[PDB]
């Protein structure tokens, strides 16, 4: 059927409507002839019936921090995707506003986690001396050991207790 | 007249280089269409497969999954179900990158919390260690009651475990591993 094509393109338009990505359909001249709701959302400016380059001097605000994405003047940070297509170019837009927003919060919290991350580290180190401390502690319960043998393990135990006390103090020094 | 063919190939490319997956089912629930993105995300064959069969092989839900749905590969994608004349129109978006970030923040704020409790997590850590050394030092005399000696002996082990447990509480808390 020839009408089936109308129903086919109908299901296609259906995609662009609920598609979570901007779709700008330019023309040989360079005019926005079509824009889905996601495109109008991010740009938040008149799209259809405007000049692509003109839209760039309104909803776009380039910055140095911008790499793969481009900062919109409305605050959003989006990535552009230009592809080869005859009879107008296609431009797919993605919303990475949240992406960079989350990234701009890890750097700040990365320094705040320094002290905490140091304690977490010093805590993992304690597992080593403690492991050896429990072994030498069990040797104190071993059978048939001379008097000078009990003091040997005891002497080796205090070493672990000391090496362990210096790590906890190091940890229990970051405080208040 | 011919404003369709040219408009078809135009939209035909949109789904080709689309950054989001597009799945079109029918009433029975059989996969009929699948763009390259969807294939990359799901990996397993789609074209000519029962959607419910794919859900078992492709998807792999979890409890931690809030809005998104974890896939077999581990990536977390969000499903957007939309009405359609011919079955449903399921779109797939990848939020593995976001989630990852959302998980990091928590872990960072997690470490900060431990950094503020270091003060309170002091008395709980020195108490057992101090005892271990208090008894360990006593077990170094010329000769003393054997029963009393074995009495202190039992203390140590318990003191060390109390500490061990107190230290494992920190690491487990510090490890975070939540809000993934």
mmCIF file of C-alpha atoms in Angstrom:
data_model
loop_
_atom_site.group_PDB
_atom_site.id
_atom_site.type_symbol
_atom_site.label_atom_id
_atom_site.label_comp_id
_atom_site.label_asym_id
_atom_site.label_seq_id
_atom_site.Cartn_x
_atom_site.Cartn_y
_atom_site.Cartn_z
ATOM 1 C CA UNK A 1 0.000 0.000 0.000
ATOM 2 C CA UNK A 2 1.042 3.607 -0.640
ATOM 3 C CA UNK A 3 -0.815 4.744 2.488
ATOM 4 C CA UNK A 4 1.279 2.347 4.601
ATOM 5 C CA UNK A 5 4.140 4.827 4.150
ATOM 6 C CA UNK A 6 2.003 7.520 5.810
ATOM 7 C CA UNK A 7 1.440 5.170 8.759
ATOM 8 C CA UNK A 8 5.150 4.296 8.674
ATOM 9 C CA UNK A 9 6.254 7.936 8.923
ATOM 10 C CA UNK A 10 3.503 8.343 11.527
ATOM 11 C CA UNK A 11 5.208 5.821 13.814
ATOM 12 C CA UNK A 12 8.467 7.664 13.098
ATOM 13 C CA UNK A 13 7.087 11.056 14.146
ATOM 14 C CA UNK A 14 5.781 9.193 17.208
ATOM 15 C CA UNK A 15 9.418 8.423 18.070
ATOM 16 C CA UNK A 16 10.628 12.035 17.844
ATOM 17 C CA UNK A 17 7.716 13.088 20.077
ATOM 18 C CA UNK A 18 8.719 10.848 23.004
ATOM 19 C CA UNK A 19 12.393 10.582 21.976
ATOM 20 C CA UNK A 20 14.615 11.737 24.911
ATOM 21 C CA UNK A 21 17.032 13.494 22.544
ATOM 22 C CA UNK A 22 16.826 16.706 20.500
ATOM 23 C CA UNK A 23 16.377 16.349 16.730
ATOM 24 C CA UNK A 24 17.024 19.422 14.570
ATOM 25 C CA UNK A 25 16.172 19.066 10.871
ATOM 26 C CA UNK A 26 17.963 21.741 8.832
ATOM 27 C CA UNK A 27 17.703 22.424 5.090
ATOM 28 C CA UNK A 28 20.210 23.073 2.277
ATOM 29 C CA UNK A 29 19.800 26.791 3.049
ATOM 30 C CA UNK A 30 20.168 26.280 6.808
ATOM 31 C CA UNK A 31 16.719 26.795 8.340
ATOM 32 C CA UNK A 32 15.161 24.783 11.174
ATOM 33 C CA UNK A 33 12.193 23.060 9.522
ATOM 34 C CA UNK A 34 11.522 20.610 12.363
ATOM 35 C CA UNK A 35 12.262 20.241 16.080
ATOM 36 C CA UNK A 36 10.905 17.670 18.546
ATOM 37 C CA UNK A 37 9.701 18.572 22.100
ATOM 38 C CA UNK A 38 13.050 17.521 23.600
ATOM 39 C CA UNK A 39 14.874 20.030 21.380
ATOM 40 C CA UNK A 40 12.482 22.854 22.305
ATOM 41 C CA UNK A 41 12.959 21.921 25.972
ATOM 42 C CA UNK A 42 16.767 22.169 26.114
ATOM 43 C CA UNK A 43 17.039 25.182 23.780
ATOM 44 C CA UNK A 44 13.915 26.852 25.235
ATOM 45 C CA UNK A 45 13.735 29.364 22.356
ATOM 46 C CA UNK A 46 11.936 29.655 18.955
ATOM 47 C CA UNK A 47 13.400 26.882 16.779
ATOM 48 C CA UNK A 48 11.258 26.181 13.698
ATOM 49 C CA UNK A 49 11.319 29.087 11.227
ATOM 50 C CA UNK A 50 14.671 30.415 12.481
ATOM 51 C CA UNK A 51 18.269 30.397 11.225
ATOM 52 C CA UNK A 52 20.473 27.726 12.829
ATOM 53 C CA UNK A 53 23.346 30.198 13.272
ATOM 54 C CA UNK A 54 20.859 32.734 14.660
ATOM 55 C CA UNK A 55 19.714 30.210 17.287
ATOM 56 C CA UNK A 56 23.382 29.765 18.248
ATOM 57 C CA UNK A 57 23.600 33.491 19.073
ATOM 58 C CA UNK A 58 20.701 33.153 21.541
ATOM 59 C CA UNK A 59 20.487 29.770 23.294
ATOM 60 C CA UNK A 60 24.236 29.052 23.145
ATOM 61 C CA UNK A 61 26.878 30.508 25.474
ATOM 62 C CA UNK A 62 30.298 28.904 24.701
ATOM 63 C CA UNK A 63 32.776 28.511 27.573
ATOM 64 C CA UNK A 64 36.371 27.308 27.998
ATOM 65 C CA UNK A 65 35.414 24.422 30.312
ATOM 66 C CA UNK A 66 33.291 23.140 27.419
ATOM 67 C CA UNK A 67 34.902 20.135 25.723
ATOM 68 C CA UNK A 68 32.626 17.674 23.918
ATOM 69 C CA UNK A 69 29.527 19.511 25.170
ATOM 70 C CA UNK A 70 28.489 23.143 24.685
ATOM 71 C CA UNK A 71 27.040 25.388 27.401
ATOM 72 C CA UNK A 72 23.580 26.771 26.620
ATOM 73 C CA UNK A 73 22.703 30.296 27.763
ATOM 74 C CA UNK A 74 19.848 28.816 29.822
ATOM 75 C CA UNK A 75 22.448 26.971 31.938
ATOM 76 C CA UNK A 76 22.148 23.486 30.397
ATOM 77 C CA UNK A 77 25.215 21.654 29.066
ATOM 78 C CA UNK A 78 24.500 19.590 25.943
ATOM 79 C CA UNK A 79 26.506 17.541 23.438
ATOM 80 C CA UNK A 80 25.949 18.046 19.710
ATOM 81 C CA UNK A 81 26.049 15.363 17.010
ATOM 82 C CA UNK A 82 26.457 16.440 13.380
ATOM 83 C CA UNK A 83 25.987 13.829 10.645
ATOM 84 C CA UNK A 84 26.219 13.845 6.845
ATOM 85 C CA UNK A 85 22.803 14.115 5.177
ATOM 86 C CA UNK A 86 21.645 15.575 1.855
ATOM 87 C CA UNK A 87 18.779 18.090 1.785
ATOM 88 C CA UNK A 88 19.637 19.622 5.164
ATOM 89 C CA UNK A 89 21.916 18.473 7.992
ATOM 90 C CA UNK A 90 20.828 16.495 11.065
ATOM 91 C CA UNK A 91 21.795 17.526 14.603
ATOM 92 C CA UNK A 92 21.058 15.213 17.541
ATOM 93 C CA UNK A 93 21.309 16.795 21.001
ATOM 94 C CA UNK A 94 21.785 15.017 24.341
ATOM 95 C CA UNK A 95 21.197 16.407 27.844
ATOM 96 C CA UNK A 96 24.372 16.210 29.954
ATOM 97 C CA UNK A 97 23.350 18.985 32.356
ATOM 98 C CA UNK A 98 23.040 16.456 35.186
ATOM 99 C CA UNK A 99 26.270 14.727 34.126
ATOM 100 C CA UNK A 100 28.524 17.778 34.581
ATOM 101 C CA UNK A 101 26.441 18.855 37.583
ATOM 102 C CA UNK A 102 27.319 15.597 39.359
ATOM 103 C CA UNK A 103 30.966 15.888 38.250
ATOM 104 C CA UNK A 104 31.158 19.412 39.700
ATOM 105 C CA UNK A 105 30.192 17.911 43.072
ATOM 106 C CA UNK A 106 32.648 14.991 43.239
ATOM 107 C CA UNK A 107 35.708 17.265 43.036
ATOM 108 C CA UNK A 108 34.508 19.302 46.030
ATOM 109 C CA UNK A 109 33.610 16.185 48.036
ATOM 110 C CA UNK A 110 36.869 14.547 46.955
ATOM 111 C CA UNK A 111 38.797 16.985 49.169
ATOM 112 C CA UNK A 112 36.240 16.743 51.991
ATOM 113 C CA UNK A 113 36.666 12.949 51.892
ATOM 114 C CA UNK A 114 40.462 13.321 52.222
ATOM 115 C CA UNK A 115 40.542 13.093 56.027
ATOM 116 C CA UNK A 116 37.789 10.454 56.014
ATOM 117 C CA UNK A 117 39.520 8.478 53.248
ATOM 118 C CA UNK A 118 42.756 8.670 55.250
ATOM 119 C CA UNK A 119 41.049 7.156 58.307
ATOM 120 C CA UNK A 120 39.520 4.447 56.098
ATOM 121 C CA UNK A 121 43.031 3.712 54.826
ATOM 122 C CA UNK A 122 44.652 3.617 58.279
ATOM 123 C CA UNK A 123 41.797 1.284 59.258
ATOM 124 C CA UNK A 124 42.658 -1.212 56.503
ATOM 125 C CA UNK A 125 46.316 -1.145 57.590
ATOM 126 C CA UNK A 126 45.318 -2.171 61.138
ATOM 127 C CA UNK A 127 44.162 -5.541 59.747
ATOM 128 C CA UNK A 128 47.805 -6.536 59.155
ATOM 129 C CA UNK A 129 49.413 -5.932 62.629
ATOM 130 C CA UNK A 130 46.223 -7.206 64.280
ATOM 131 C CA UNK A 131 46.342 -10.430 62.246
ATOM 132 C CA UNK A 132 49.893 -11.105 63.468
ATOM 133 C CA UNK A 133 48.993 -9.938 66.989
ATOM 134 C CA UNK A 134 46.301 -12.626 67.269
ATOM 135 C CA UNK A 135 48.743 -15.318 66.082
ATOM 136 C CA UNK A 136 51.346 -14.450 68.731
ATOM 137 C CA UNK A 137 48.492 -14.161 71.244
ATOM 138 C CA UNK A 138 47.482 -17.752 70.453
ATOM 139 C CA UNK A 139 51.077 -18.930 70.975
ATOM 140 C CA UNK A 140 50.698 -17.817 74.606
ATOM 141 C CA UNK A 141 48.078 -20.568 74.905
ATOM 142 C CA UNK A 142 50.283 -23.207 73.246
ATOM 143 C CA UNK A 143 51.223 -26.313 75.329
ATOM 144 C CA UNK A 144 54.520 -27.223 77.024
ATOM 145 C CA UNK A 145 56.405 -23.927 76.658
ATOM 146 C CA UNK A 146 59.482 -23.108 78.837
ATOM 147 C CA UNK A 147 59.475 -19.916 81.005
ATOM 148 C CA UNK A 148 61.799 -18.137 78.562
ATOM 149 C CA UNK A 149 59.544 -19.206 75.674
ATOM 150 C CA UNK A 150 56.432 -17.469 77.027
ATOM 151 C CA UNK A 151 58.341 -14.178 77.288
ATOM 152 C CA UNK A 152 59.557 -14.556 73.691
ATOM 153 C CA UNK A 153 56.055 -14.381 72.200
ATOM 154 C CA UNK A 154 55.171 -11.746 74.812
ATOM 155 C CA UNK A 155 58.105 -9.653 73.572
ATOM 156 C CA UNK A 156 56.890 -10.163 69.991
ATOM 157 C CA UNK A 157 53.313 -9.369 71.045
ATOM 158 C CA UNK A 158 54.115 -5.951 72.537
ATOM 159 C CA UNK A 159 55.883 -5.148 69.248
ATOM 160 C CA UNK A 160 52.586 -5.756 67.431
ATOM 161 C CA UNK A 161 50.683 -3.864 70.143
ATOM 162 C CA UNK A 162 53.072 -0.918 69.727
ATOM 163 C CA UNK A 163 53.047 -1.025 65.912
ATOM 164 C CA UNK A 164 49.258 -1.229 66.281
ATOM 165 C CA UNK A 165 48.988 1.554 68.877
ATOM 166 C CA UNK A 166 50.937 3.939 66.621
ATOM 167 C CA UNK A 167 48.511 3.313 63.739
ATOM 168 C CA UNK A 168 45.377 3.835 65.850
ATOM 169 C CA UNK A 169 46.853 6.995 67.399
ATOM 170 C CA UNK A 170 47.742 8.154 63.878
ATOM 171 C CA UNK A 171 44.091 7.472 63.009
ATOM 172 C CA UNK A 172 42.701 8.756 66.329
ATOM 173 C CA UNK A 173 44.721 11.952 65.849
ATOM 174 C CA UNK A 174 42.518 13.465 63.171
ATOM 175 C CA UNK A 175 39.843 14.630 65.598
ATOM 176 C CA UNK A 176 37.288 17.375 66.403
ATOM 177 C CA UNK B 1 3.141 12.441 -3.882
ATOM 178 C CA UNK B 2 6.862 11.838 -3.298
ATOM 179 C CA UNK B 3 7.191 13.844 -0.070
ATOM 180 C CA UNK B 4 7.189 10.523 1.811
ATOM 181 C CA UNK B 5 10.139 8.548 0.409
ATOM 182 C CA UNK B 6 12.424 11.556 0.951
ATOM 183 C CA UNK B 7 10.927 12.075 4.422
ATOM 184 C CA UNK B 8 11.305 8.352 5.204
ATOM 185 C CA UNK B 9 15.025 8.102 4.390
ATOM 186 C CA UNK B 10 15.434 11.285 6.442
ATOM 187 C CA UNK B 11 13.831 9.765 9.550
ATOM 188 C CA UNK B 12 15.416 6.413 8.644
ATOM 189 C CA UNK B 13 18.822 7.926 9.459
ATOM 190 C CA UNK B 14 17.617 9.587 12.679
ATOM 191 C CA UNK B 15 17.189 6.170 14.338
ATOM 192 C CA UNK B 16 20.411 4.910 12.728
ATOM 193 C CA UNK B 17 22.736 7.419 14.434
ATOM 194 C CA UNK B 18 20.457 7.821 17.468
ATOM 195 C CA UNK B 19 22.100 7.819 20.957
ATOM 196 C CA UNK B 20 19.049 6.024 22.397
ATOM 197 C CA UNK B 21 17.575 2.591 21.639
ATOM 198 C CA UNK B 22 14.198 2.183 19.916
ATOM 199 C CA UNK B 23 12.128 -1.010 20.194
ATOM 200 C CA UNK B 24 8.709 -1.405 18.558
ATOM 201 C CA UNK B 25 6.582 -4.348 19.729
ATOM 202 C CA UNK B 26 3.146 -5.608 18.654
ATOM 203 C CA UNK B 27 0.026 -6.788 20.513
ATOM 204 C CA UNK B 28 1.440 -10.282 21.126
ATOM 205 C CA UNK B 29 4.760 -8.693 22.148
ATOM 206 C CA UNK B 30 7.097 -9.718 19.315
ATOM 207 C CA UNK B 31 10.098 -7.543 18.416
ATOM 208 C CA UNK B 32 9.636 -6.038 14.946
ATOM 209 C CA UNK B 33 12.098 -3.122 14.886
ATOM 210 C CA UNK B 34 15.454 -2.448 16.562
ATOM 211 C CA UNK B 35 17.960 0.336 15.836
ATOM 212 C CA UNK B 36 21.783 -0.077 16.197
ATOM 213 C CA UNK B 37 21.885 1.614 19.616
ATOM 214 C CA UNK B 38 19.355 -0.810 21.119
ATOM 215 C CA UNK B 39 21.355 -3.734 19.707
ATOM 216 C CA UNK B 40 24.582 -2.408 21.242
ATOM 217 C CA UNK B 41 22.935 -1.959 24.658
ATOM 218 C CA UNK B 42 21.081 -5.303 24.750
ATOM 219 C CA UNK B 43 23.868 -7.147 22.837
ATOM 220 C CA UNK B 44 21.791 -10.327 22.355
ATOM 221 C CA UNK B 45 19.772 -10.793 19.099
ATOM 222 C CA UNK B 46 16.577 -8.720 18.933
ATOM 223 C CA UNK B 47 15.196 -8.847 15.370
ATOM 224 C CA UNK B 48 12.624 -11.668 15.355
ATOM 225 C CA UNK B 49 12.404 -12.538 19.064
ATOM 226 C CA UNK B 50 9.704 -12.517 21.742
ATOM 227 C CA UNK B 51 10.195 -9.430 23.912
ATOM 228 C CA UNK B 52 9.506 -11.521 27.031
ATOM 229 C CA UNK B 53 12.225 -13.972 25.974
ATOM 230 C CA UNK B 54 14.704 -11.105 25.572
ATOM 231 C CA UNK B 55 13.743 -9.636 28.967
ATOM 232 C CA UNK B 56 14.959 -12.893 30.547
ATOM 233 C CA UNK B 57 18.235 -13.105 28.607
ATOM 234 C CA UNK B 58 18.953 -9.389 28.067
ATOM 235 C CA UNK B 59 17.658 -7.731 31.246
ATOM 236 C CA UNK B 60 18.666 -8.743 34.778
ATOM 237 C CA UNK B 61 16.701 -6.703 37.398
ATOM 238 C CA UNK B 62 17.901 -5.966 40.938
ATOM 239 C CA UNK B 63 16.527 -4.480 44.165
ATOM 240 C CA UNK B 64 18.917 -1.511 44.082
ATOM 241 C CA UNK B 65 17.332 -0.643 40.718
ATOM 242 C CA UNK B 66 15.074 2.343 41.411
ATOM 243 C CA UNK B 67 13.867 3.793 38.100
ATOM 244 C CA UNK B 68 16.371 2.115 35.760
ATOM 245 C CA UNK B 69 16.640 -1.625 35.067
ATOM 246 C CA UNK B 70 20.034 -3.366 35.183
ATOM 247 C CA UNK B 71 21.073 -5.361 32.107
ATOM 248 C CA UNK B 72 23.045 -8.622 31.874
ATOM 249 C CA UNK B 73 26.182 -6.614 31.028
ATOM 250 C CA UNK B 74 25.688 -4.552 34.208
ATOM 251 C CA UNK B 75 24.707 -1.265 32.527
ATOM 252 C CA UNK B 76 21.615 0.429 33.979
ATOM 253 C CA UNK B 77 19.094 1.654 31.397
ATOM 254 C CA UNK B 78 15.723 3.372 31.830
ATOM 255 C CA UNK B 79 12.658 2.107 29.965
ATOM 256 C CA UNK B 80 10.114 4.594 28.626
ATOM 257 C CA UNK B 81 6.908 2.764 27.683
ATOM 258 C CA UNK B 82 4.672 4.659 25.250
ATOM 259 C CA UNK B 83 1.352 3.806 23.598
ATOM 260 C CA UNK B 84 1.393 2.785 19.930
ATOM 261 C CA UNK B 85 -1.122 1.700 17.286
ATOM 262 C CA UNK B 86 1.068 -1.352 16.657
ATOM 263 C CA UNK B 87 1.882 -2.693 20.134
ATOM 264 C CA UNK B 88 4.252 -0.585 22.252
ATOM 265 C CA UNK B 89 7.130 1.813 21.595
ATOM 266 C CA UNK B 90 9.922 1.125 24.080
ATOM 267 C CA UNK B 91 12.861 3.544 24.172
ATOM 268 C CA UNK B 92 16.157 2.760 25.899
ATOM 269 C CA UNK B 93 18.504 5.314 27.464
ATOM 270 C CA UNK B 94 21.778 4.549 29.239
ATOM 271 C CA UNK B 95 22.195 6.010 32.737
ATOM 272 C CA UNK B 96 25.183 3.852 33.693
ATOM 273 C CA UNK B 97 27.340 6.993 33.595
ATOM 274 C CA UNK B 98 24.943 8.974 35.807
ATOM 275 C CA UNK B 99 24.355 6.141 38.297
ATOM 276 C CA UNK B 100 28.127 5.731 38.553
ATOM 277 C CA UNK B 101 28.399 9.416 39.518
ATOM 278 C CA UNK B 102 25.431 9.190 41.909
ATOM 279 C CA UNK B 103 27.203 6.242 43.551
ATOM 280 C CA UNK B 104 30.503 8.129 43.868
ATOM 281 C CA UNK B 105 28.959 11.179 45.578
ATOM 282 C CA UNK B 106 27.422 8.895 48.212
ATOM 283 C CA UNK B 107 30.774 7.155 48.788
ATOM 284 C CA UNK B 108 32.474 10.560 49.124
ATOM 285 C CA UNK B 109 29.840 11.865 51.564
ATOM 286 C CA UNK B 110 30.233 8.450 53.195
ATOM 287 C CA UNK B 111 33.951 8.942 53.903
ATOM 288 C CA UNK B 112 33.225 12.472 55.162
ATOM 289 C CA UNK B 113 30.796 11.034 57.719
ATOM 290 C CA UNK B 114 33.507 8.669 58.973
ATOM 291 C CA UNK B 115 35.862 11.661 59.113
ATOM 292 C CA UNK B 116 33.481 13.483 61.477
ATOM 293 C CA UNK B 117 32.927 10.414 63.676
ATOM 294 C CA UNK B 118 36.657 9.748 64.089
ATOM 295 C CA UNK B 119 36.291 11.616 67.400
ATOM 296 C CA UNK B 120 33.467 9.405 68.705
ATOM 297 C CA UNK B 121 35.089 6.304 67.147
ATOM 298 C CA UNK B 122 38.014 6.821 69.545
ATOM 299 C CA UNK B 123 36.832 5.622 72.967
ATOM 300 C CA UNK B 124 35.408 2.548 71.207
ATOM 301 C CA UNK B 125 38.816 1.721 69.690
ATOM 302 C CA UNK B 126 41.275 2.573 72.486
ATOM 303 C CA UNK B 127 39.246 0.860 75.238
ATOM 304 C CA UNK B 128 39.884 -2.709 73.894
ATOM 305 C CA UNK B 129 43.447 -1.999 72.718
ATOM 306 C CA UNK B 130 44.374 -0.427 76.064
ATOM 307 C CA UNK B 131 43.118 -3.569 77.818
ATOM 308 C CA UNK B 132 45.075 -5.854 75.476
ATOM 309 C CA UNK B 133 48.283 -4.019 76.427
ATOM 310 C CA UNK B 134 47.207 -3.816 80.081
ATOM 311 C CA UNK B 135 47.047 -7.623 80.267
ATOM 312 C CA UNK B 136 49.881 -8.329 77.802
ATOM 313 C CA UNK B 137 52.225 -6.315 80.039
ATOM 314 C CA UNK B 138 51.109 -8.305 83.101
ATOM 315 C CA UNK B 139 52.007 -11.578 81.344
ATOM 316 C CA UNK B 140 55.733 -10.936 81.831
ATOM 317 C CA UNK B 141 56.579 -11.753 85.456
ATOM 318 C CA UNK B 142 59.040 -14.329 86.934
ATOM 319 C CA UNK B 143 56.186 -16.573 88.098
ATOM 320 C CA UNK B 144 52.519 -16.034 89.007
ATOM 321 C CA UNK B 145 49.330 -18.152 89.535
ATOM 322 C CA UNK B 146 48.697 -20.316 86.400
ATOM 323 C CA UNK B 147 44.906 -20.050 86.731
ATOM 324 C CA UNK B 148 45.122 -16.252 86.947
ATOM 325 C CA UNK B 149 47.572 -16.347 84.026
ATOM 326 C CA UNK B 150 45.107 -18.222 81.803
ATOM 327 C CA UNK B 151 42.433 -15.826 83.081
ATOM 328 C CA UNK B 152 44.259 -12.849 81.532
ATOM 329 C CA UNK B 153 45.034 -15.009 78.482
ATOM 330 C CA UNK B 154 41.320 -15.294 77.667
ATOM 331 C CA UNK B 155 40.897 -11.516 78.041
ATOM 332 C CA UNK B 156 43.443 -10.621 75.328
ATOM 333 C CA UNK B 157 41.778 -12.712 72.606
ATOM 334 C CA UNK B 158 38.420 -11.132 73.509
ATOM 335 C CA UNK B 159 39.946 -7.636 73.661
ATOM 336 C CA UNK B 160 41.500 -8.109 70.209
ATOM 337 C CA UNK B 161 38.224 -9.387 68.729
ATOM 338 C CA UNK B 162 36.296 -6.457 70.221
ATOM 339 C CA UNK B 163 38.812 -4.207 68.456
ATOM 340 C CA UNK B 164 38.780 -6.339 65.292
ATOM 341 C CA UNK B 165 34.986 -6.040 65.212
ATOM 342 C CA UNK B 166 35.222 -2.316 65.971
ATOM 343 C CA UNK B 167 37.711 -1.845 63.110
ATOM 344 C CA UNK B 168 35.680 -3.963 60.654
ATOM 345 C CA UNK B 169 32.682 -1.738 61.442
ATOM 346 C CA UNK B 170 34.638 1.256 60.126
ATOM 347 C CA UNK B 171 35.879 -0.429 56.929
ATOM 348 C CA UNK B 172 32.430 -1.834 56.155
ATOM 349 C CA UNK B 173 30.956 1.637 56.669
ATOM 350 C CA UNK B 174 33.815 3.305 54.767
ATOM 351 C CA UNK B 175 33.510 0.813 51.888
ATOM 352 C CA UNK B 176 30.148 2.442 51.100
ATOM 353 C CA UNK B 177 28.887 0.381 48.147
ATOM 354 C CA UNK B 178 25.370 1.848 48.220
ATOM 355 C CA UNK B 179 23.066 3.949 46.030
ATOM 356 C CA UNK B 180 24.584 2.285 42.949
#
